[PDB]
Write a protein that binds this ligand. Structure first.
Ligand SMILES: CCCCCCCCCCCCCCCCCC(=O)OC[C@H](CO[C@@H]1O[C@H](CO[C@H]2O[C@H](CO)[C@H](O)[C@H](O)[C@H]2O)[C@H](O)[C@H](O)[C@H]1O)OC(=O)CCCCCCCCCCCCCCCCC
Ligand code: CLA
Ligand code: CLA
Ligand code: CLA
Ligand code: CLA
Ligand code: CLA
Ligand SMILES: C=Cc1c(C)c2cc3nc(c4c5[nH]c(cc6nc(cc1[nH]2)C(C)=C6CC)c(C)c5C(=O)[C@@H]4C(=O)OC)[C@@H](CCC(=O)OC/C=C(\C)CCC[C@H](C)CCC[C@H](C)CCCC(C)C)[C@@H]3C
Ligand SMILES: CCCCCCCCCCCCCCCCCC(=O)OC[C@H](CO[C@@H]1O[C@H](CO)[C@H](O)[C@H](O)[C@H]1O)OC(=O)CCCCCCCCCCCCCCCCC
Ligand SMILES: CC1=C(/C=C/C(C)=C/C=C/C(C)=C/C=C/C=C(C)/C=C/C=C(C)/C=C/C2=C(C)CCCC2(C)C)C(C)(C)CCC1
Ligand SMILES: CC1=C(/C=C/C(C)=C/C=C/C(C)=C/C=C/C=C(C)/C=C/C=C(C)/C=C/C2=C(C)CCCC2(C)C)C(C)(C)CCC1
Ligand code: OEY
Ligand SMILES: [Cl-]
Ligand SMILES: [Cl-]
Ligand SMILES: [Fe+2]
Lengths: 38, 505, 55, 65, 37, 36, 56, 33, 30, 341, 81, 34, 34, 32, 30
């Protein structure tokens, strides 16, 4: 049913998710504080 | 004038003649399919699906016909070896004729669309310019694709209205076209489960109908239209090429590792079956159990079907060929006639010895015999003067169980060595080398040739994707950069955001 | 090529890694050496009567 | 340009060239299907690769019977 | 019905002919040994 | 702001490299990897 | 013959582990790289002087 | 030598077909100016 | 036949050289 | 003026290192492939996958250090850190070859990122994307050699290992087992790499020796101005020179620089195709006609037969230590050897 | 030209060398210790000079199983203990 | 284990030292960010 | 008026910080004995 | 059937060469 | 090979017929 490797899969999926979202949380913040004028 | 490498760009704004080009391409492909089959039928020998199956004969389209259920000839034979059948119209011959008639009919339609290029249909009613609404075209074609995909799985593969598909046991011994029930659980994603293929087409077909319907009714977002140049038919060529090389990689992969749709009676064994000794394990499982259950050695091996023994031979390993070694595998080692028997080597102490099998990597390989534990006890020496394990010194003999040589033993050293030389290839077979003037060098199988071609085309189409995508996205500078680009847009710091002229400081 | 003509040859790290006991711990240089050895012993298979190919 | 009976029938299917939904339209929803499809291809790949191992999924020829 | 306005002349200059023939002859010289095998 | 003269930075940086690289070549002869 | 020469050279001189051969490879890989770079960089910045129907 | 008999036709066509194509395009280019 | 083929192709290349050099499109200024 | 646009703004600012949307894929993956290689080559062994030492820690030097491929028993396992092989244990993951797949896969996505960067910057600056297109050749080589080749083989074990001497070993494997020098796709690659180096040298030298005198000094570098309109060297004198020395010369600067893109890119593309053939052991190993003659006629000898003897020595002498998982035991008497050696 | 401080001007600045005359040897010492303490061996699983073979062993402890490989090297490592 | 503090201690002092020499200037830069 | 912490700063120290640390580890190694 | 295998090349060239001649002359006629 | 060759030539002629009827130079009345 729910085997070690499937738990490992979900582990990988959440780590990737953490990483990409945290990356984008940072990028979205900086881009708001330091805007180009125009 | 146009350079040679651009002559076909004259179709880019000519939907009619584009359709005529596409029709002509489709005709040529359908014609090839018909011509290839007819050549294959003129050269195929159906008299022995055991030792001279199609994959030994360099048959390339025949197995794809057989995969989806075409198995007989109007001549009365079938690829499973049963005789007396009537296949009806949809024999190999009839499939070939249909593709030829199709090619012919496509050819005429092509003429008509080339002459009557100027159809009002292809004109934007607002501007009078030629214009293809590609977003809606996608929805329409996608919807069609979903219907056909669904029908193929729902009716052809199931046998509700169709023949099914080729299936077999795990050792490729009893294949046939059978209807297949969808596997809806997680094992339908297993590549070796044929019911997964049924489920895939039914489910994906329905998703294609829904997406189709979405793409006919819902207009693309402005942001995406402009980002992907959806007014530019070359953005379709770019993404279409991308999808094609993706698909080409997938089909190369499953051909090489094997799946439910590349069965070994149509394409031959995989190299991995040799690596893992797949057939040797099974063969020994059977002898081992023939013997526990009483039988003699002669009897346990005589029970081994020749078709299974023939898989356990490296000359059918697809990883043993060469690029320029052309033609059918039979042109190399010959036409297999008979299993000679399983060869059992003993030294002078009566120990059973094992020939180390050649790995696929090696064009040549030395002859080394071992005991059940892996210790070297005999070999064919290169340098004789210090040899200690020669067959002459170890008094090596070969006995045969099953097959043609069953119950025969050889003791003369050159004969024993000679079967030892062949035993590195696995099981030992008698070949007809004269009929084709076989040269004795291994060639690859249709499994090998198909993987090679498709992996190569895939890689080349990756460059196609890159080229035409660049061309879609940089159409405005294809001919060169703007002659009044000023250094301020290119030098550093002038603009906060690169290329964005509204961001000076 | 011009200096290997005077037999000042590529770096030789054959058996340069050994363990606390003095076992040889092969590196990729040792694997290269096994290939070189296969070339050496087979080239001009009939020409050498004596055990070292000094030119 | 030449009008044909079939041309007039298909006419409205090639009549909306250039029409777009405003702004981002359905892009957020596309991204969801894209992300789901990725995970699903991941699973399919890792099943074939044997780094996803599942009960009753024997990735072997021996799953023909 | 008008003549089709998309038609275009095709060119191959003399240098491109020389380059192309060299390509083909050198390709033939390289592969022929493998074709004869 | 510009207190250390650049030529001095270069020489000390220069000798720093020579030192470490020289150590690595010394170690080709001593210890692990020396054949001894 | 060329291949026979390079195989025997490797066995008698270990040319691959010789730094001057390693510099040749850098000279040749590098030379092909910079050929591609420079040809692609000039070609990318050609000034528009032609139409899409003719060779740039 | 026991060489592939089709090598010849393969080589001949490999040379002739692409060459004839280039010649066709060159000569008709020249008949323009 | 293989010998004839190889030499023929080489011979064609050598003639091509002749035309490429002495019957080139002559470069012309501005 | 939504967030997506604001991020676009920030990603595309002119700064010392441009970032871009493509930076999001490129920079993490390039940094990780590179760091994986420097981490493995400094600290990680190959003892359990290859029977080899392969780091500085172990006593190797820059030439012999490597991040080695996984054991042949791993097949084509992704060898994810969290996968069933390593089971999340960093250490075992290192010892089983996990860094090989880490580098190769992150390298792959980095390469994609780098080519997306070439596309991204070219669009922002307004130039044609021919530098990206050119970069397709490196990509083709990398995937064909590091991904497709071993995927056709029994395992990742037979891919190149990421190291200097390990690659040298990969060269010699291909000679002995595939006879790769005999392969016409490798030959076209050689001609493209050597042809490219030639072009690079001959073009640079020609410009440097057809220069116009645009300054009074003996260093001629000072006398160029990047915004000058005038060509800085004479195409005319260059063309007459080469026409008289070589017989032909370039007359079209555009074609010349396109050819300089074309030659090395194509050569690399051809060699990729041939390595795809070798993924399947689809070799140009032999010439059948030669073998039939030499089998029958023991006086017939060519450089082709001479080189196969060499391949045969290579295979038998390197195979047991190079393929430890096969437990090849070749006793002395079976090794091929000429006289005396 | 992009508005970051020029490198030339940074590595001659007194403030710069005041920080990096500490940060650069601290990292050099840091990495030294990683080795001198033996931590690098244990983190990475790299054998010490004395732990490649067991005493009378001349067998490579080669991994031979895919999903049991973790257990294999664990066994090989106790065959030293 | 304990070697991890040996290893990390210098780098923290390096980070500490650099934290203190630069802090006044690092806060001027953050002020300028609106 | 120059920023201190930039994207540039970060890319610099991304590479330079572990370089020095790695150099120190590789320095210790020349004294390892079998 | 034991036919002359130079017959393939002779038939092939018998067709190809004169036809190519004809085509070359027609196409350059059409472009002037 | 000989059957393919005879069939191919025959098939080229049928294709010649088509072009010669439908793609002839139209005769016109100067
Ligand atoms: C160009 C632009 C480049 C941009 C690309 C960017 C990088 C993308 C990265 C993708 C990573 C791909 C991972 C591939 C892993 C793989 O394949 O892993 C291999 C696995 C299959 O695993 C192998 O399977 C083999 C066959 O086993 C079978 O046979 C055995 C003997 O009979 C037993 O029966 C066994 O049970 C049965 O399963 C062997 O066992 C191998 O040991 C085992 O590794 O495939 C699977 O995961 C999936 C296989 C099908 C998917 C298609 C693969 C496409 C790639 C291949 C295309 C090239 C074709 C190569 C041929 C040359
Ligand atoms: C590609 C898209 C797709 C589609 C259309 C389906 C469709 C289906 N799946 Mg499959 N599935 C997919 C992908 C897909 N799956 C993938 C990628 C996996 C991972 C391996 C699975 C794993 C999976 C399992 C384990 C099972 C199914 C099942 C089902 C069926 C419906 C079950 C139900 O009513 O629950 C609602 C289902 C949906 C709303 C759609 C799919 C939702 C996910 C994919 C699975 C739900 C699991 C379910 C709760 C477990 C019940 C059994 C339990 C004892 C373990 C249906 C035929 C079940 C079945 O038929 O039994 C054999 C089942 O047990 N699927
Ligand atoms: C996907 C394509 C494909 C595949 C996989 C096969 C597979 C097969 N065919 Mg089929 N075939 C195909 C297409 C295909 N065919 C087509 C299109 C035709 C019509 C031309 C045929 C006609 C055909 C016949 C007539 C026969 C086969 C036969 C066979 C078998 C032997 C093949 C062999 O020896 O190849 C040999 C392959 C090579 C020698 C490799 C050639 C590729 C060269 C090296 C590349 C060219 C390089 C290029 C010039 C580089 C320049 C690039 C640069 C300058 C930019 C095999 C099962 C044979 C068989 O046994 O059938 C019974 C047979 O007799 N095929
Ligand atoms: C669906 C596939 C597809 C389609 C429809 C096109 C269509 C087009 N290409 Mg793209 N392209 C593709 C795949 C495709 N390409 C792939 C896979 C590659 C990588 C090789 C390219 C690389 C490419 C380049 C580099 C260029 C084009 C250009 C063009 C345009 C002009 C081409 C022309 O006139 O050829 C004229 C061709 C000839 C007169 C003869 C070609 C002879 C070839 C070398 C050998 C023939 C092989 C034979 C027919 C077998 C068939 C192939 C087999 C795979 C089935 C046209 C829009 C050109 C362009 O953009 O112009 C603006 C251009 O410069 N294409
Ligand atoms: C990726 C792998 C790789 C790479 C990139 C290289 C790269 C190189 N190798 Mg190494 N090599 C390798 C693997 C590799 N090798 C392996 C595996 C081995 C071991 C088996 C060797 C063994 C090896 C040896 C033994 C030698 C090389 C040499 C070379 C160089 C050859 C190019 C050269 O000499 O240009 C230089 C240019 C020329 C040689 C040509 C001069 C041309 C003359 C002046 C004019 C000719 C005119 C012509 C006849 C007519 C044309 C006119 C026309 C009308 C016909 C180059 C640095 C060679 C080298 O360093 O030689 C100096 C050499 O001898 N390598
Ligand atoms: C951003 C660029 C990037 C990319 C493209 C990759 C790509 C990869 N990495 Mg690398 N990695 C990165 C950055 C990156 N990494 C960073 C920043 C780190 C430092 C932490 C690492 C550390 C790292 C390690 C340590 C390893 C990899 C590995 C891998 C491979 C497998 C990744 C995988 O399976 O994803 C799986 C996950 C995804 C694809 C995520 C999909 C996200 C979906 C769309 C959202 C899901 C949301 C969630 C489920 C919902 C919430 C749940 C609920 C509880 C609320 C792959 C080549 C592995 C490898 O190389 O094996 C050899 C490996 O072992 N990476
Ligand atoms: C071994 C030869 C070789 C190397 C090392 C090399 C290197 C490079 N070529 C580049 C570019 C190019 N190469 C081109 C053509 C060519 N390049 C060639 C051969 C090479 N090119 C050849 C022969 C050609 C001719 C066609 C072009 C046209 C370009 C460019 O435009 C580009 C450039 O800017 O040039 C100046 C750069 C791309 C930077 C990058 O992706 O960073 C990002 C780094 C990433 C994504 C990490 C990749 C990691 C790799 C793939 C795996 C890990 C590698 C290990 C860390 C190191 C292992 C080393 C051991 C094996 C010894 C990089 C400097
Ligand atoms: C249009 C016309 C111009 C095209 C023809 C031009 C000639 C080119 C010839 C190329 C073929 C060379 C074959 C020489 C061998 C031959 O003569 O033997 C002739 C062999 C047939 O094999 C013959 O078969 C006989 C009984 O079947 C016997 O076995 C003979 O011994 C055996 O030679 O020809 C074929 O196999 C032809 C089909 C090959 C198709 C597979 C290609 C797939 C590979 C894809 C790679 C793409 C790479 C692109 C890279 C860019
Ligand atoms: C008219 C008509 C008709 C008829 C038809 C026909 C008769 C057709 C045929 C057709 C066909 C008969 C076709 C064929 C085709 C073929 C082709 C199309 C081929 C192709 C090929 C290729 C392309 C190849 C290439 C190559 C080579 C050569 C070498 C190797 C590589 C490659 C593979 C690349 C009919 C009665 C029905 C109907 C009415 C009308
Ligand atoms: C893997 C991994 C990871 C990551 C990692 C990394 C990222 C790292 C980095 C690393 C690095 C980053 C390192 C560095 C190093 C460095 C080095 C070690 C250097 C050296 C050099 C030298 C030695 C030099 C010298 C010289 C010479 C010799 C000559 C010339 C001159 C010169 C000076 C240059 C993670 C965590 C995610 C987890 C998982 C795994
Ligand atoms: O490498 Mn080996 O070394 Ca120079 O010679 Mn002695 O053998 Mn022979 O002649 Mn050519 O070759
Ligand atoms: Cl020799
Ligand atoms: Cl001697
Ligand atoms: Fe230039």
């Amino acid at each position: 049913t729910i085997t070690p490797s499937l738990k490992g899969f979900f582990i990988g999926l959440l780590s990737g998710a953490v990483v990409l979202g945290l990356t984008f949380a940072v990028l979205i913040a900086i881009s708001q504080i330091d805007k180009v004028q125009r | 004038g146009l350079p040679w490498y651009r002559v076909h760009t004259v179709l880019i704004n000519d939907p009619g003649r584009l359709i005529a080009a596409h029709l002509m391409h489709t005709a040529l492909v359908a014609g090839w399919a018909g011509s290839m089959a007819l050549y294959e039928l003129a050269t195929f020998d159906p008299s022995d699906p055991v030792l001279n199956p199609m994959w030994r004969q360099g048959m390339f389209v025949l197995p794809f016909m057989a995969r989806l259920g075409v198995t007989g000839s109007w001549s009365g034979w079938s690829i499973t070896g049963e005789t007396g059948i009537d296949p009806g119209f949809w024999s190999f011959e009839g499939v070939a004729l249909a593709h030829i008639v199709l090619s012919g009919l496509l050819f005429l339609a092509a003429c008509w669309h080339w002459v009557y290029w100027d159809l009002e249909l292809f004109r934007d009613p607002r501007t009078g310019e030629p214009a293809l609404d590609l977003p809606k075209m996608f929805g329409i074609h996608l919807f069609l694709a979903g219907l056909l995909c669904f029908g193929f799985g729902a009716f052809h593969l199931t046998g509700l209205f169709g023949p099914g598909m080729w299936v077999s046991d795990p050792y490729g011994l009893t294949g046939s076209v059978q209807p297949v029930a969808p596997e809806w659980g997680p094992d339908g994603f297993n590549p070796y489960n044929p019911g997964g293929v049924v489920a895939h087409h039914i489910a994906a077909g329905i998703v294609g109908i829904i997406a189709g319907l979405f793409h006919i009714l819902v207009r693309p977002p402005q942001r995406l239209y402009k980002a992907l140049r959806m007014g530019n038919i070359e953005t379709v060529l770019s993404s279409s090429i991308a999808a094609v090389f993706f698909a080409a990689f997938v089909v190369a992969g499953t051909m090489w590792y094997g799946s439910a749709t590349t069965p070994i009676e149509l394409f031959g064994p995989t190299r991995y079956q040799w690596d893992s000794s797949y057939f040797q394990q099974e063969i020994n499982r059977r002898v081992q159990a023939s013997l526990a259950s009483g039988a003699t050695l002669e009897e346990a091996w005589s029970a081994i079907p020749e078709k299974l023994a023939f898989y356990d031979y490296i000359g059918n390993n697809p990883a043993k060929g060469g690029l320029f070694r052309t033609g059918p595998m039979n042109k190399g080692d010959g036409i297999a006639q008979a299993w000679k028997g399983h060869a059992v080597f003993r030294n002078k102490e009566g120990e059973e010895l094992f020939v180390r099998r050649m790995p696929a990597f090696f064009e040549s390989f030395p002859v080394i015999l071992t005991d059940k534990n892996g210790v070297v006890k005999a070999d064919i020496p290169f340098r004789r003067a210090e040899s200690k394990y020669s067959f002459e010194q170890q008094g090596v003999t070969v006995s045969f169980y099953g097959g043609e040589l069953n119950g025969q033993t050889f003791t003369d050293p050159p004969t024993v060595k000679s079967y030892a030389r062949k035993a590195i290839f696995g099981e030992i077979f008698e070949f007809d080398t004269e009929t084709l003037n076989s040269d004795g060098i291994f060639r690859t199988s249709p499994r090998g040739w198909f993987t090679f071609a498709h992996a190569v085309f895939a890689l080349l189409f990756f460059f196609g994707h890159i080229w035409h995508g660049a061309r879609t996205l940089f159409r405005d500078v294809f001919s060169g950069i703007d002659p009044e680009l000023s250094p301020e847009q290119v030098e550093w710091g002038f603009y906060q955001k690169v290329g964005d002229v509204t961001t000076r400081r | 090529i011009s200096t290997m003509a005077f037999n000042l040859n590529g770096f030789n790290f054959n058996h340069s890694v050994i363990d606390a006991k003095g076992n040889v711990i092969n590196t990729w240089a040792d694997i290269i050496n096994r290939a070189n050895l296969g070339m050496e012993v087979m080239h001009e298979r009939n020409a050498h009567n004596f055990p070292l190919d000094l030119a | 340009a030449r009008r044909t009976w079939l041309g007039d029938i298909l006419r409205p299917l090639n009549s909306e060239y250039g029409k777009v939904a405003p702004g981002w339209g359905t892009t957020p929803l596309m991204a969801v299907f894209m992300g789901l499809f990725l995970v699903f291809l991941l699973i399919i790949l890792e099943i074939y690769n044997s780094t996803l191992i599942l009960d009753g999924v024997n990735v072997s020829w021996k799953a023909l019977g | 019905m008008e003549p089709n306005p998309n038609r275009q002349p095709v060119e191959l200059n003399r240098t491109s002919l020389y380059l192309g023939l060299l390509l083909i002859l050198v390709l033939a010289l390289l592969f022929s040994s493998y074709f004869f095998n | 702001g510009g207190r250390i003269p650049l030529w001095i930075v270069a020489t000390v940086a220069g000798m720093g490299v020579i030192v470490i690289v020289g150590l690595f070549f010394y170690g080709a002869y001593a210890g692990l990897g020396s054949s001894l | 013959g060329t291949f026979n020469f390079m195989i025997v050279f490797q066995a008698e001189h270990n040319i691959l582990m010789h730094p001057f051969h390693q510099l040749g490879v850098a000279g040749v890989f590098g030379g092909a790289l910079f050929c591609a770079m420079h040809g692609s960089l000039v070609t990318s910045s050609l000034i528009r002087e032609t139409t899409e129907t003719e060779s740039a | 030598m026991e060489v592939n008999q089709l090598g010849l036709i393969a080589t001949a066509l490999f040379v002739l077909v692409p060459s004839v194509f280039l010649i066709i395009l060159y000569v008709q280019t020249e008949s323009q100016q | 036949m293989e010998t004839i083929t190889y030499v023929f192709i080489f011979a064609c290349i050598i003639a091509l050289f002749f035309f490429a050099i002495f019957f080139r499109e002559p470069p012309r200024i501005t | 003026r939504g967030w997506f646009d604001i991020l676009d703004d920030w990603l595309k600012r002119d700064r010392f290192v441009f970032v871009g949307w493509s930076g999001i894929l490129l920079f993490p993956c390039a940094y990780l492939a590179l760091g994986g290689w420097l981490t493995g080559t400094t600290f990680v062994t190959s003892w359990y996958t290859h029977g080899l030492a392969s780091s500085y820690l172990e006593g190797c030097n820059f030439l012999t250090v490597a991040v080695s491929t996984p054991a042949n028993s791993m097949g084509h396992s992704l060898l994810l850190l969290w996968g069933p092989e390593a089971q999340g244990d960093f250490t075992r993951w290192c010892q089983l070859g996990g860094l090989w797949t880490f580098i190769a896969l992150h390298g792959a996505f980095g390469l994609i990122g780098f080519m997306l960067r070439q596309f991204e910057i070219a669009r922002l600056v307004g130039v044609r994307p021919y530098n990206a297109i050119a970069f397709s050749a490196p990509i083709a080589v990398f995937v064909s050699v590091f991904l497709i080749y071993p995927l056709g083989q029994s395992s990742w074990f037979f891919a190149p290992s990421f190291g200097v001497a390990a690659i040298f070993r990969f060269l010699l494997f291909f000679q002995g087992f595939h006879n790769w020098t005999l392969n016409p796709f490798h030959m076209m690659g050689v001609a493209g790499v050597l042809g490219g180096a030639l072009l690079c040298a001959i073009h640079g030298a020609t410009v440097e020796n057809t220069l116009f005198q645009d300054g009074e000094g003996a260093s001629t570098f000072r006398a160029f101005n990047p915004t000058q309109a005038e060509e800085t060297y004479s195409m005319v004198t260059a063309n007459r020179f080469w026409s008289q020395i070589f017989g032909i010369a370039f007359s079209n600067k555009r074609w010349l620089h396109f050819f300089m893109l074309f030659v090395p890119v194509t050569g690399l593309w051809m060699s990729a195709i041939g390595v795809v053939g070798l993924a399947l052991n689809l070799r140009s190993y032999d010439f059948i006609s030669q073998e039939i003659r030499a089998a029958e006629d023991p006086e017939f000898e060519t450089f082709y037969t001479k080189n196969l003897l060499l391949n045969e020595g290579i295979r038998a002498w390197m195979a047991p230590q190079d393929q430890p998982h096969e437990n090849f035991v070749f006793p002395e008497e079976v090794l091929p050897r000429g006289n005396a050696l | 030209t992009t508005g970051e401080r020029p490198f030339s001007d940074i590595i001659t600045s007194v403030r710069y060398w005041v920080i990096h005359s500490i940060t650069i040897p601290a990292l050099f010492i840091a990495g030294w210790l990683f080795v001198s303490t033996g931590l690098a061996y244990d983190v990475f699983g790299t054998p010490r000079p004395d732990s490649y073979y067991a005493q009378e062993q001349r067998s490579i402890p080669l991994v031979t199983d895919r999903f049991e490989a973790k257990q294999q090297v664990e066994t090989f490592l106790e065959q030293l203990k | 284990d304990w070697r991890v503090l040996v290893v990390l201690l210098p780098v923290l002092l390096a980070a500490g030292w650099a934290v203190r020499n630069i802090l006044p200037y690092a806060v001027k830069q953050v002020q300028k960010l609106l | 008026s120059y920023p201190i912490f930039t994207v540039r700063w970060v890319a610099v120290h991304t590479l330079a910080v572990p370089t020095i640390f790695f150099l120190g580890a590789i320095a210790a190694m020349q004294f390892i004995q079998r």
